[PDB]
Design a protein around this ligand. Structure first.
Ligand SMILES: [Zn+2]
Ligand SMILES: [Zn+2]
Lengths: 33, 33, 33, 33
């Protein structure tokens, strides 16, 4: 695959990981309270 | 073990995910170039 | 509430594993260049 | 170099494999808590 298609895949993985970080941060806040 | 210590671990995992999300965004930029 | 929390973490864990597989596949392809 | 990017993607994949297992471990802890 061209580098552009690679970049496209990585940006979708990046936003999924960011979403999952927010999910864990929210759970962590719950548990720490 | 304390529940706060679990919450702390989840905070750390979330940190790795925020960091990885940024790293992938950066790499995607690099490849877009 | 710990049972629902456990279930959420398992959901996220599966998602991270799947994303790891995806990145490894992408890494293989870029390394073959 | 595309080799350096590939190596970095393999490393981010490792972080994700590791996090996935950590979350599964924490989920188990919470389930028996
Ligand atoms: Zn970094
Ligand atoms: Zn660990």
């Amino acid at each position: 695959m061209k580098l552009k298609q690679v970049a496209d895949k990585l940006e979708e993985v990046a936003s999924k990981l960011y979403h999952n970080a927010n999910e864990l941060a929210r759970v962590a806040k719950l548990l720490g309270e």
